[PDB]
Design a protein around this ligand. Structure first.
Ligand SMILES: O=CNCc1cc(COc2ccc(CCNC(=O)CC[C@@H](NC(=O)CC[C@H](NC(=O)CC[C@@H](C(=O)O)[C@H](CCC(=O)O)C(=O)O)C(=O)O)C(=O)O)cc2)co1
Ligand SMILES: Nc1nc2c(c(=O)[nH]1)N[C@H]1C(S)=C(S)[C@@H](COP(=O)(O)OP(=O)(O)OC[C@H]3O[C@@H](n4cnc5c(=O)[nH]c(N)nc54)[C@H](O)[C@@H]3O)O[C@H]1N2
Ligand SMILES: Nc1nc2c(c(=O)[nH]1)N[C@H]1C(S)=C(S)[C@@H](COP(=O)(O)OP(=O)(O)OC[C@H]3O[C@@H](n4cnc5c(=O)[nH]c(N)nc54)[C@H](O)[C@@H]3O)O[C@H]1N2
Ligand code: SF4
Ligand code: SF4
Ligand code: SF4
Ligand code: SF4
Ligand code: SF4
Ligand code: SF4
Ligand SMILES: [Cl-]
Ligand SMILES: [K+]
Ligand SMILES: [K+]
Ligand SMILES: [K+]
Ligand SMILES: [K+]
Ligand SMILES: [K+]
Ligand SMILES: [K+]
Ligand SMILES: [Mg+2]
Ligand code: NA
Ligand SMILES: [S]
Ligand SMILES: [W+6]
Ligand SMILES: [Zn+2]
Ligand SMILES: [Zn+2]
Lengths: 268, 80, 430, 116, 568, 129
């Protein structure tokens, strides 16, 4: 069930380890896991070369729990496209944690880099620290992004979280920077802290909730008034919210920004 | 008398005056179309070694169009 | 003295091809038609260092070596590197850029051009929402409304206005008088001084202004009574100017790629240009900087499928700007070696990236003394494209024009240097 | 009514209300014959709700007119009749329909809103 | 030399239909006999055909690379690196090295880029240099050219013929391409033309007059290929009448190639998109029977279909106004490029979902065109790649044509029922033979392009461009085993290119550069000098480059292969 | 004084880079800060006086110059170059492109000298290899 990865000294040239996921670890002895391939720059190497490996094997990915007992700030793509099981990282991760994930759960106990949960389809990612740009985003050029799952950031995130979101749910308990929900089509974003600017820029649908303060907003939204005790995608919200519909720079736009009245009188 | 005078040290070589001038336009179809002349032509001024350079001041009719086209006051109509 | 005509200028993306070069001896001593910048490249400035031979830094002091030694030391650096960065490209010709793509492939390198510090954000935006452009000739002969948005052509593309605005076109015989000129810039630039309309908006607020403009355009009311420092009433007056155009061209530049929002500033601008076409013909052109930044993005795209920030580490080409871009690898300390060609990141990268260049092997294929050569370990001087070497370059709107060889040089061209660098990188890997 | 919002010594109250649009409390027809119109501007000046707009210009030999268009914005017009009475060349046709057709064409206003 | 022994040879131009027979090759040519020291390629139980010849694809140029550059998501879905060769990416619009490799894998050895803007011609030729193996050519665009419109309005066909002569030499091009004539010029102001009698703004010449005049020019310079027509009113319900009217305009022009065996004056491309009935998208119906029957009765026309492959792909055309309309419909990212005095272009992604009613009907229309046209010598296999689908799907198009079962499985399953209700595809039981497919993938294209002396056939004198497919026609059934047909035409067992082995067991094993065919024409000195004096005058006034820098220089053609039009 | 730092092109800085970045011409064209005349008087400086520019990200000494292209109130202009790039914002927000324009900085007069091109680069401390 529990397979322990203890990281050695992390390299300046980052690692790419898409193969660190329950789906690959299933049905493998400890030694075969040491021999799983990962990338180290432009060189193909073995997982054993940068991690000690202990624990007990298992045949099915849902019964597998990967624990990375140490900081892995310079390894990318952990949990990429995992379908089941669990990953727990006792430290930081780099980019693409859980990208393309379909099921299971990842817990990062420190920070995550950009593109955490890119193209997410299902499952859960929980990041106890701060996150980078493009939480739950799409890929360059693609107009179809995240379609399902849950991402929860307990710290702060940066720019363009939920870029082209098309389903699922992102929760930032901290602050975000600019353009949360840019080009959103569907889904739910809840920012419990503040937003600097451009919440919902060019969104066509979906719902963004801001419980803190938006320093600036966008003139393409129509003010519809105030709603109390709204409930969105199975989530219960107390208090009153200023309600906006946009972004009417986009044709047929039906997106909704809710902004808490207590800190957003200047937005109305 | 009022005449055309160049201040090359302030000049950008941008070519707006060369193209804007109707005398230059009349004599050189390429200048009329915004190009520097490649044909040999006698026109009022050209951009040479990166700056405006007056070659035939006698053809200047002091209309003022070039001056309107210069943003940095590098070509002017003034005494002498 | 010799007068060489129809020369193509090797500086900015205007890529003027009507330059006259004055040649005395085997040397370019003057120009005609070239602007102040173009002239300064063609002619040698006295006291300016023109490297005659390769150089290598042996601990703390530069020593002249031969081409074979410098290339050999450079090839070994790239061969043994596990995350090499191959950056620059915009100021050489396309066939050298093609060799660079193959060399990045062989070395498992990341190849990237100045787009990553320039109109890269426009690339990201056009990949997401589109790219409605035209060539200079349609502007000159058709353009009814000409906008310069966050660009200062009088200082950065000096002949751009004379060739596209003051020029008399087929349907625009009166040149400047037939066109409404609009400039959008927080400064009253010398370009803005010539404008009929100068929107002197608040900096970092273009995205907000473009949102109001687009909502208005599609029939909606503007929420706030002032946006980006521009009162509601003139937002609407400006949208009407654009809607009533017969042919509109939006030239845009660094004012919105470097500004807050970056690629999303270009995004909202493009889509407005797109939507304006239900009322009036409208198109846009990014004011690409170097005379052949566009040429690299073309070559790299058609050879690999991606335009810049291309990572060959896995063999396969991969592409994610923000991870695989020059400044990303340097500032996050991923790159363990760097090869610069035809570019000056020492002068033109931010502090945090220079801190990393101080720690790693830097190769510089460069003819002149620059801040990058001051940070370089190996210096390899080449023949200069457009003066001493010929090849393809691409104008800012995609028009291909061949650079000319005007005078001879004993130095090797970029292409020859890269092909020798590529041969011996293969030697080491075998 | 928002009395409590005003009265609250702590500004603790938010009262919102959506009022009907002006067009929906008013009914009539208005047309301007622009060929008859000589652009004297008197209707634009007298219109108390600024519903009439004239595209003024300086004449040129190509366009020897002092204006190129005139328009009435029916989102603003309340059909008071002033313009039609002041027009020196009777180029404006205007009739209010409130009294004959008001029951059918003007919906009784529903005033909506919330409190917090 | 090589001897390829005991293969079932299919070569329609020389009337060989599956005979067991050996093909002899020496120094890049097919020969009558070779020394017994020749190397043997065993084709026992396998099909032997000429190298494929694609007459219409978008593989090299500005319009193509915009599609590549602005679709990184298309590259991420399909990125590859073969051990011996160059990396590449792009499912719908592959990079150049991938493009040549993948034509080669399916046994194609010649492919023509169908739309090149003259001012951007260096771009096309540069991408050709990086496209391995295939011989190639490019079609410059003329149907919205300012010089063409001005000359033909005055009725001066001789001057237009001199202009075209100069332009084909200067851009190193091969055919007079025509896309939405006059309409793309109208798109320069944001409009379009509707029907063949609707003139462009200012220039005041109709589509019909442009088509006729250029057909006239085409044969007056005795070009190997005919005019290559992309009709007005593309992709709109009810346009079949505009198409049929278009087909009649040059019928009274007499073909006159100086090179090759072409006997047709009109080549109509991807006409599936021009076979639409109804009046809006909801009463949209197929009118391919009327189109197919026009083709059957008439001898002056060759077509290609532009078959829907039911993929997520990318559209890219010189039909600017149409692409903006398509972007208006599907809301997806849109690129555009108007080229001064010459043409325009647009690029939009499109998802041809089988479950959607409109793509279902369009799929049927193309199948109807293949099958209701009786004579394969009048039709070519195309997907207007990538507009209707990537060229990698030619084997699937073959499989569909060869199998009643494959089609009905798709009709009765994923295809929207509009394919049955709004077309006749379900009632059509015809299956193509291996000979008819070799005709529509080799012979018709080679013949009509004027290359049948050296391409599209296995006779003595032909270039040694040959494909061997691992199919046994005596033992395998086209109809039931359709997935074996598709898989086998996808990865050729052996391919030779100019006598050299370039593919083995589906894998690319060599990367030679192919030739660039262009057309060499000569016109009376006096006509030519006067036109070039006029051309240089408009360059000085109205172009944004200088006349001296415009023509494609010789270094862009390392492998120049001129073909003769009219001389002296 | 807190001001907004904007950076970019100048015809003189273009002439200088194509003449030579080792030349004095380049320091004169790129090691400068353009200011409105009212702001220079607010700071008590004249043309030719030097200014210390400090930001969250670095610090630099540049020569004060009166802007011939007027700036909005509160904005200053340093041409693109290594002096400006001592102080502008490096982060790319996952786009690869730094924030070269519109950066909050603190400016104060100084008697320190402007660093010439090779001396400025030694601040980064290049170690050979
Ligand atoms: N160099 C050449 C080149 C080529 C190219 C490539 O260009 C082209 C050009 C043209 C396009 C195509 C244009 N795009 C479109 O049509 C998009 C869809 C279109 N919508 C419809 O058609 C709507 C049909 C829909 N009908 C139904 O849902 C019927 C259900 C029936 C049933 O259930 O069976 C129902 C039956 C109910 C029952 O059973 O009783 C019924 O029949 O109504 C409706 O309701 O109206 C729109 O959204 O507008 C593509 C590419 C580029 O360059
Ligand atoms: N603060 C700030 N910083 C910026 C910007 C800004 O606006 N503000 N702008 C950014 C932008 S857009 C850009 S593009 C960069 C500038 O991009 P850079 O590439 O740094 O621009 P240059 O300094 O002109 O560098 C071009 C170099 O190529 C050399 N060269 C010329 N011809 C040839 C040739 O044929 N072969 C070779 N090998 N070399 C040749 C020249 O000597 C010169 O050193 O600056 C960026 N940095
Ligand atoms: N002389 C010279 N010419 C050059 C170069 C050079 O170094 N020197 N380099 C070349 C290169 S690489 C390039 S990319 C081009 C670049 O050409 P440009 O795009 O003109 O680049 P910049 O001059 O950096 O910026 C142009 C304008 O953007 C404005 N701006 C700043 N902030 C904002 C904002 O928030 N909103 C708006 N709307 N505008 C803003 C600035 O005021 C400035 O006037 O120039 C090329 N030409
Ligand atoms: S003045 Fe009138 S004429 Fe004399 S130059 Fe300037 S423009 Fe040409
Ligand atoms: S003068 Fe004013 S305009 Fe004529 S060039 Fe020198 S600068 Fe450009
Ligand atoms: S403009 Fe750009 S290109 Fe035309 S000259 Fe001055 S610099 Fe060389
Ligand atoms: S409560 Fe509703 S009504 Fe009584 S006052 Fe406050 S608002 Fe007017
Ligand atoms: S008043 Fe009668 S005339 Fe004078 S303007 Fe209003 S309408 Fe035209
Ligand atoms: S009617 Fe009373 S209101 Fe309606 S327009 Fe004439 S005046 Fe202004
Ligand atoms: Cl000077
Ligand atoms: K002036
Ligand atoms: K120089
Ligand atoms: K109160
Ligand atoms: K009034
Ligand atoms: K691509
Ligand atoms: K055109
Ligand atoms: Mg995207
Ligand atoms: Na055309
Ligand atoms: S650039
Ligand atoms: W640039
Ligand atoms: Zn077509
Ligand atoms: Zn086509």
């Amino acid at each position: 069930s529990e397979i322990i990865l203890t990281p050695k000294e992390q390299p300046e040239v980052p690692l790419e380890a898409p193969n660190i996921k329950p789906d690959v670890f299933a049905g493998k002895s400890i030694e075969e896991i040491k021999n799983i391939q990962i990338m180290h720059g432009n060189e193909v190497v073995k997982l054993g070369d940068f991690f000690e490996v202990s624990g007990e094997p298992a045949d099915a990915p849902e019964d597998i729990k990967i624990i990375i007992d140490g900081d892995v700030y310079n390894t990318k793509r952990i949990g990429q496209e995992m379908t089941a099981g669990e990953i727990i990282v006792r430290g930081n991760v780099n980019m693409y944690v859980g990208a393309g994930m379909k099921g299971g759960k990842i817990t990062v106990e420190g920070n995550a880099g950009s593109w955490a949960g890119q193209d997410m389809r299902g499952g859960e990612i929980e990041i106890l620290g701060d996150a980078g740009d493009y939480v739950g985003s799409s890929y360059r050029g693609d107009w179809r992004g995240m379609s399902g799952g849950t991402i929860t950031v307990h710290g702060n995130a940066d720019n363009e979280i939920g870029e082209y979101m098309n389903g699922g749910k992102i929760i930032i308990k901290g602050d975000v920077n600019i353009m949360p929900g840019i080009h959103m089509n569907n889904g739910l974003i809840i920012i419990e802290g503040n937003v600097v600017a451009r919440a919902g820029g060019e969104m066509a649908g979906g719902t963004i909730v801001v419980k803190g303060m938006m320093q600036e907003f966008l003139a393409g939204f129509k003010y519809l008034g105030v709603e109390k005790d709204i409930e969105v995608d199975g989530e219960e919200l107390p208090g009153a919210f200023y309600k906006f519909e946009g972004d009417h720079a986009i044709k047929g736009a039906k997106g909704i920004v809710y902004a808490a009245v207590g800190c957003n009188g200047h937005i109305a | 008398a009022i005449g055309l005078k160049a201040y090359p040290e302030l000049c950008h070589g941008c070519g707006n005056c060369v193209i804007a001038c109707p005398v230059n336009a009349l004599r050189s179809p390429e200048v009329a179309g915004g190009k520097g002349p490649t044909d040999d032509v006698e026109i009022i001024m050209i951009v040479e070694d990166g700056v405006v350079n007056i070659k035939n001041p006698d053809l200047c009719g002091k209309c003022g169009t070039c001056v309107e086209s210069c943003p940095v006051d590098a070509i002017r109509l003034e005494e002498l | 003295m010799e007068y060489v005509k129809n020369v193509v200028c090797p500086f900015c993306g205007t890529l003027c091809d009507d330059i006259i070069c004055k040649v005395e001896g085997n040397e370019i001593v003057g120009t005609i038609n070239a602007c102040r910048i173009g002239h300064s490249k063609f002619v040698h400035a006295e006291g300016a260092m023109r490297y005659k031979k390769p150089l290598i830094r042996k601990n703390g002091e530069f020593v002249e070596v031969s081409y074979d030694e410098a290339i050999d030391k450079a090839a070994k650096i790239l061969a043994e590197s596990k995350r090499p960065l191959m950056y620059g490209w915009s100021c050489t010709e396309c066939e050298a850029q093609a060799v660079g793509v193959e060399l990045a492939e062989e070395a498992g390198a990341v190849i990237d051009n100045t787009a990553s510090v320039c109109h890269g954000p426009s690339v990201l935006a056009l990949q997401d929402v589109g790219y409605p452009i035209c060539t200079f000739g349609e502007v000159k002969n058709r353009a009814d409304v000409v906008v310069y948005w966050g660009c200062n052509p009088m200082h950065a593309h000096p002949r751009h206005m004379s060739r596209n605005v003051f020029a008399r076109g087929f349907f625009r015989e009166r040149g400047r008088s037939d066109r409404t000129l609009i400039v959008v810039d927080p400064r009253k630039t010398d370009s803005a001084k010539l404008a009929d309309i100068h929107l002197q908006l608040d900096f970092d607020r273009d995205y907000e202004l473009l949102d109001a403009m687009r909502a208005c355009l599609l029939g909606h009311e503007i929420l706030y009574d002032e946006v980006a420092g521009v009162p509601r009433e003139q937002i609407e007056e400006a949208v009407e100017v654009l809607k009533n155009a017969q042919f509109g061209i939006l030239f845009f530049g660094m004012g919105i790629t470097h500004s807050r929002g970056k690629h999303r500033n270009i995004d909202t601008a493009i889509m407005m240009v797109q939507d304006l076409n239900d009322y009036a013909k409208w198109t846009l052109i990014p004011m690409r900087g170097h005379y052949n930044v566009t040429g690299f993005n073309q070559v790299c795209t058609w050879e690999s499928g991606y335009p810049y920030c291309v990572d060959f580490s896995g063999g396969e080409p991969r592409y994610n700007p923000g991870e695989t871009g020059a400044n990303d690898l340097l500032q996050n300390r991923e790159a363990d070696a760097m090869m610069v060609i035809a570019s000056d990141p020492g002068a033109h990268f931010p502090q945090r990236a220079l801190e990393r260049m101080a720690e790693i092997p830097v190769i510089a294929i460069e003819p002149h003394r620059t801040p990058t050569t001051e940070m370089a370990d190996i210096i390899i001087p080449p023949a200069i494209v457009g003066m001493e070497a010929e090849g393809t370059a691409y104008r800012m709107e995609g028009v291909p024009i061949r650079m000319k060889k005007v005078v001879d040089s004993d130095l090797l061209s970029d292409r020859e240097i890269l092909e020798r660098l590529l041969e011996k990188v293969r030697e080491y890997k075998a | 009514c928002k009395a409590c919002e005003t009265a609250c010594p702590q500004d603790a109250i938010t009262i919102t209300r959506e009022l009907p649009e002006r067009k929906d409390l008013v009914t009539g027809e208005i047309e301007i014959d622009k060929d008859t119109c000589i652009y004297c501007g008197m209707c634009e000046e007298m219109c108390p709700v600024d519903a009439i707009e004239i595209d003024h210009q300086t004449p040129s030999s190509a366009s020897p007119v002092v204006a190129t268009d005139i328009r009435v914005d029916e989102d603003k017009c309340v059909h008071c009749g002033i313009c039609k009475r002041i027009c020196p060349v009777d180029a404006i046709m205007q009739v209010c329909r409130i009294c004959p057709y008001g029951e059918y064409e003007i919906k009784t206003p529903e005033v909506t809103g919330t409190s917090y | 030399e090589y001897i390829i022994k005991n293969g079932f040879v299919y070569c329609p131009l020389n009337g060989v239909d599956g005979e067991k027979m050996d093909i002899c090759v020496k120094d890049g040519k097919i020969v009558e006999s070779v020394s017994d020291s020749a190397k043997v390629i065993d084709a026992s139980g396998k099909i032997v055909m000429p190298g494929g010849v694609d007459p219409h694809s978008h593989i090299a140029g500005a319009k193509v690379n915009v599609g590549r550059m602005y679709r990184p998501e298309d590259s991420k879905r399909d990125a590859e690196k073969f051990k011996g060769g160059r990396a590449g990416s792009g499912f719908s619009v592959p990079s150049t090295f991938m493009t040549g490799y993948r034509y080669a894998q399916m046994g194609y050895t010649t492919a023509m880029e169908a739309a090149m803007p003259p001012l951007l011609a260096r771009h096309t030729h540069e991408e050709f240099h990086d496209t391995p193996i295939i011989d190639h050519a490019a079609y410059p665009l003329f149907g919205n050219n300012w010089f063409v419109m001005e000359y033909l309005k005055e009725g001066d066909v001789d001057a237009c013929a001199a202009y075209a002569s100069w332009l084909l030499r200067a851009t190193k091009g091969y055919t007079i391409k025509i896309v939405n004539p006059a309409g793309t010029e109208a798109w320069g102001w944001g409009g379009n033309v509707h029907g063949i009698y609707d003139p462009a703004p200012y220039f005041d010449i109709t589509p019909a007059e442009i088509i006729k005049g250029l057909a006239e020019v085409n044969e007056k310079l005795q070009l190997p290929h005919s005019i290559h027509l992309h009709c007005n009113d593309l992709g709109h319900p009810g346009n079949y009448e505009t198409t049929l009217a278009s087909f009649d305009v040059p019928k009274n022009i007499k073909p006159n190639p100086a090179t090759g065996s072409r006997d047709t004056v009109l080549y109509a491309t991807h006409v599936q998109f021009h076979s639409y009935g109804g009046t809006t998208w909801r009463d949209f119906v197929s009118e391919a029977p009327k189109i197919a029957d026009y083709v059957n009765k008439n001898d002056h026309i060759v077509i290609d279909v532009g078959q829907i492959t039911l993929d997520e792909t990318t559209t890219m055309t010189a039909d600017g106004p149409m692409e903006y309309d398509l972007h208006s419909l599907n809301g997806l990212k849109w690129a555009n490029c108007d080229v001064e005095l010459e043409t325009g272009s647009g690029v939009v992604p499109f998802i041809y979902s089988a479950r959607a009613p409109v793509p279902a009907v369009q799929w049927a229309i193309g199948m109807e065109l293949f099958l209701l046209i009786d004579n394969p010598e009048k039709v070519c296999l195309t997907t207007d790649s990538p507009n209707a689908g990537p060229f990698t799907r030619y084997p699937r198009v073959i499989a569909w044509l060869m199998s009643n079962k494959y089609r009905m499985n798709l009709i009765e399953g994923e295809l929207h029922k509009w394919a049955q209700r709004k077309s006749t595809v379900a009632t059509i039981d015809r299956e193509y033979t291996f000979s008819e497919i070799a005709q529509i993938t080799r012979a018709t294209s080679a013949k009509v392009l004027g290359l049948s002396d050296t391409k599209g056939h296995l006779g003595v004198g032909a270039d040694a461009d040959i494909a061997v497919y691992d199919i046994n026609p005596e033992t395998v059934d086209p109809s039931a085993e359709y997935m074996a047909i598709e898989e086998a035409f996808s990865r050729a067992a052996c391919v030779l290119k100019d006598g050299e082995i370039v593919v083995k067991d589906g894998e690319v094993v060599a990367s030679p550069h192919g030739r660039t065919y262009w057309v060499d024409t000569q016109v009376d000195e006096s006509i030519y000098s006067e036109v070039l004096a006029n051309v240089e005058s408009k360059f000085k006034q109205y172009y944004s480059v200088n006349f001296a820098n415009y023509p494609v220089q010789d270094d862009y053609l390392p492998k120049s292969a001129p073909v003769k039009g009219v001389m002296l | 004084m807190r001001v907004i730092l904007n950076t970019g092109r100048t015809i003189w800085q273009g002439q200088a880079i194509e003449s030579g970045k080792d030349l004095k011409m380049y320091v004169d064209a790129a090691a400068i800060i353009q200011m409105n005349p009212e702001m220079m008087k607010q700071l008590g400086i004249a043309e030719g006086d030097n200014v210390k520019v400090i930001s969250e990200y670095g610090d630099v000494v540049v020569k004060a110059v009166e802007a011939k292209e007027p700036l909005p109130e509160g904005m200053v202009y340093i041409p693109m170059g290594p002096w400006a790039n001592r102080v502008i914002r490096p982060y790319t927000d996952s786009t690869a492109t730094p924030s070269f324009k519109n950066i909050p900085v603190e400016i104060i007069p100084t008697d320190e000298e402007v660093l010439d091109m090779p001396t400025l680069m030694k601040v980064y401390g290049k170690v050979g290899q």
